[PDB]
Amino acid sequence: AKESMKAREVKREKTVAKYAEKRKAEGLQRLPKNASPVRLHNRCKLTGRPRGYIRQFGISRVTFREMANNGLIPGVKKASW
Amino acid sequence: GQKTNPIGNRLGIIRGWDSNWYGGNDYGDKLAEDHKIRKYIHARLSKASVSKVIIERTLKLVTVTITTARPGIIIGKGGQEVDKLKEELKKVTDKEVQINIFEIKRPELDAYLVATSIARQIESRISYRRAIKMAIAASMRMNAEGIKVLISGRLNGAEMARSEGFKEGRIPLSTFRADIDYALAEAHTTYGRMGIKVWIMKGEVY
Amino acid sequence: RKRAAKKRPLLPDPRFNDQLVTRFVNNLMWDGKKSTAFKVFYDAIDIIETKTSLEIWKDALTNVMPHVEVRFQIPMQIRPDRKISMAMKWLILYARRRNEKSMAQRLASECLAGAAVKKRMDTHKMAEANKAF
RNA sequence: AACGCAAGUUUGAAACUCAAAGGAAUUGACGGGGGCCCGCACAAGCGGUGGAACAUGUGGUUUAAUUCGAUGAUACGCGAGGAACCUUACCAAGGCUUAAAUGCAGACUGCGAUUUGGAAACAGAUCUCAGUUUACAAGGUGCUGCAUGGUUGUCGUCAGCUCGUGCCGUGAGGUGUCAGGUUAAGUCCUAUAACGAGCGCAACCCCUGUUGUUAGUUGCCAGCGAGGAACUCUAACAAGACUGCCAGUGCAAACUGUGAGGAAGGUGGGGAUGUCAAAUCAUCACGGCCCUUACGCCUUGGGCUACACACGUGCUACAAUGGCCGGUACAGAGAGCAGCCACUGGGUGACCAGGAGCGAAUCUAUAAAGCCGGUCACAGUUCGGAUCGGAGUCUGCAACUCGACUCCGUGAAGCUGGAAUCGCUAGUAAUCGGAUAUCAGCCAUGAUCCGGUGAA
């Protein structure tokens, strides 16, 4: 969750912006090995915390719980059935 | 920590949501921007003692309706006092942005203005003993029968933590139909960080 | 402090329209399978047609009904109804030790009226010893 | 020293050491003291664990590293709800110092393709929001949860915990909260130096269990006909359960049975939760200490999978109420352009190519157990599934360390498991299948749910 480690994700995301037509055209691949979609781990996008992630809200479980409790996500309620 | 948030289990009930925007699976950056706008507003104008930021993220628009404790210094003269704030937050979130400043009805009953005022008195280090009763009296002058202010450890520059009840009246937290608003604001002193929790019970809603 | 009981009412079976056959197949069930238990019971009672009908089975179910159980190891009567659950449980428990081929085959112990009466005899012999209590 | 046969009796110091010994009463705690109650707590019944092989977790031993934390109940299929690189915080070796990101400060202007050294990071050339000095911050998953904020487990969904006024006691304190009934309850009646109040309980909320109205799109198919507004359905509003009805007990609450009803006596299940210096300074913030040629930073390769042993949590099998080849049915919820695939062609198969429909009551995703028929006719077997060799498919730059699946070989331990221990009172246990979450693929037998059959 360090600043360097969370900025590494942004650097890799900015690196995988080009080469979108190069990787689309088992050989002929001399790349910086960072322009691949297999190295993009998803963070919490506020704190930058791995080990728990929801694609819908894009944040970790602890931030999701705290915001859903203190009314920051429209729609969430207390599930009961 | 063995108590649920009082406004947490009240959303499908009398308590509503702060933000207002329906996006199917697209919370993402629309949530990151809503998280940054509130903190940017609270850091840019804190001397007005803001109460809440109703963020309405509809199509091609974002309304930033601000409920303060002092709208005079926010509107300012002629509107250029809002001009810089608006160009700032709009170039932070480069989209079509509108602002609406709301006036306050008895600012001593907001469950957050009380907390931030007590925190400011604490970090100003006057007595730590007059602020809680000041807030209690200024809140119980009027209605909202229940008020409960609880404070956390690191008190009076001591070594071990301790908590004080300091409550009076009636605050039925076990009743979903009670209209208990609450907001936690804490003071960053030199002996650490002191936490404040304010519950306000106005009355049953229907 | 259980304060109540409900006895769990039952419903009869199509064949033989009897209420004891339902209890028997309920004690026969395994992993919640009633159809195959009914099938096995029907095959068993049809194999028993060598020698009458399920009458001989229900009368053999009587020889496994104890009248006193030990539970300072004091003897006492069980109940007017738990007798026909101990009898069924003992029959079904000791019919699974017979080294036959199928379950319907090894269930041919109703004609042994054979590891079923031995239990009742041992219970009576252990209850008549502690009769001074 | 006196007395006595003796045991011993009477009289009776000091040196030295501590700031305490002691009596009465009060609150709590405890008792192998008593009384009244509750909880799958015990008694009864069912299924397990401990026996066997496999998967993860942990201790222990080695390693350059085997990242860190919890190591009774409240840790051990936990944080972690996806370890090939990435995550990664650790190790070995190459490249950096005001910084690999972010604010600033003072200048100098209007992203791409090509070429060399390379394992990359980075250096040296063409070319056409970006590039470069100076002093600034910055940074640390560094150390203490026994300095903390916040956020949880536990007693515990147990019924308890207090306050205002008034009286008793010199005082700590007592009363209200005790006594008798009542049940899930400090939930209520009766009297009582008590009268009231607050937190808690209950009610107020969600789903399910019947009926009516509002409306029929992409629910649905009853009557005529070749298109319908009755039902299911969806989602809004209402009724219905209040021991209210009928019998006995009681000043009263209130239990014991019957009748009606879809329901009973809180219909059932959930969200609600009023000391242990308990878990986290590794979600986040933070007081104090330490390093800044760095314990800071970008890379490649490796480790987190190491293995003589152990304890915990799981799956499967130990068989014929079973296996196999065949026929035949019955779902629910949830998901789908970070995709679901109808259909056709190739291949035993995973899968590949072509190619509709669908950003969702519209289109796709084909259930098992069950039923019928034949075989096996009892043992290491036509049960079992570990281990190993060869040949393929998919993802990804990369499948050896360390992915999954298919395929042809093969049949190891296992024939109901020792004291000891675990869960369960009704759609419950047991058993079978399906879906979701992390998503390039995946260890998924873990976690969260749903549906079927269904007990004692």
Q: Which of B5, B25, B27 sits opposite A70 (nearest CB)?
A: B5
Task: Return phi, psi of residue A10, to 5°.
Answer: -65, -40
Method by which the coordinates were obtained: cryo-EM
Closest CA to B109 of B67, B75, B87, B139: B139
First to last CA, chain C: 27
B57, B30 contact by CB (below 8 A): yes
Tokens at B135, concatenated: 């807030």
HEC string of chain B?
CCCCCCCHHHCCCCCCCCCECCCCCCCHHHHHHHHHHHHHHHHHCCCCCCCEEEEECCCCCEEEEEECCCCHHHHCCCCHHHHHHHHHHHHHCCCCEECCEECCCCCCCCCCHHHHHHHHHHHHCCCCCHHHHHHHHHHHCCCCCEEEEEECCCCCCCCCCCCECCEECCCCCCCCCCCEEEEECCECCCCCCECEEEEEECCCCC
How many CA atoms does the CB half-sphere of B111 hold within 13 Å? 20
* Chain B CA closest to residue A67: B8
| Alpha carbon distance B15, A74 (integer Å) | 12
Q: Which of B12, B28, B183 sits opposite A58 (nearest CB)?
A: B28
| Alpha carbon distance C63, C56 (integer Å) | 11
Q: Could you tell me if B13 lies within 8 Å of chain A, comparing CB atoms?
A: no
| Alpha carbon distance C1, B188 (integer Å) | 56
Tokens at C113, concatenated: 């009226």
Q: What Rg, from alpha-carbon coordinates, does chain A have?
A: 17
**Residue in the structure block whose two tokens are 């068993």:** C44
Closest CA to A51 of A34, A63, A38, A66: A63
Which residues pair with residue B147 across a beta bridge?
Answer: B168, B200
| Alpha carbon distance B63, B97 (integer Å) | 6
User: Distance (Å) from CA C54 to C1' D326?
Assistant: 36
DSSP state of A63: H
Query: Is residue A64 classed as helix, strand or coil in its secondary structure?
Result: helix
Closest CA to C47 of C115, C114, C117, C103: C103
> C85 beta carbon < 7 A from strand D?
yes
Q: Is C39 exposed, middle or buried (0-12, 13-18, 19+ CB in 10 A)?
A: middle
| Alpha carbon distance B178, B176 (integer Å) | 6
For residues B4-25, b (16+ Cβ closer than 10 Å) or e, as one string? eebbbbbbeeebeebbebeeee
Pairing status of strand C69-70 against strand C75-76: antiparallel
Closest CA to B103 of B128, B69, B53: B69
Which residues pair with residue B148 across a beta bridge?
Answer: B167, B199
B16, A58 contact by CB (below 8 A): no
Closest CA to C61 of C39, C83, C29, C93: C83
Q: Would you call B28 and A70 a contact, using CB atoms and an 8 Å cutoff?
A: no
Query: Strand D: which nucleotides have any atom within 7 A of a protein Cβ?
Result: 37-39, 41-47, 79-82, 84-89, 100-101, 112-113, 120-121, 139-141, 147-156, 197-207, 269-274, 277, 283-287, 296-300, 320-322, 336, 338, 360, 369-372, 377-378, 395-398, 425-426, 429-431, 437-440, 450, 452-456
| Alpha carbon distance B107, B114 (integer Å) | 8
Task: Return phi, psi of residue C54, to 5°.
Answer: -60, -5
Tokens at B146, concatenated: 């229940």
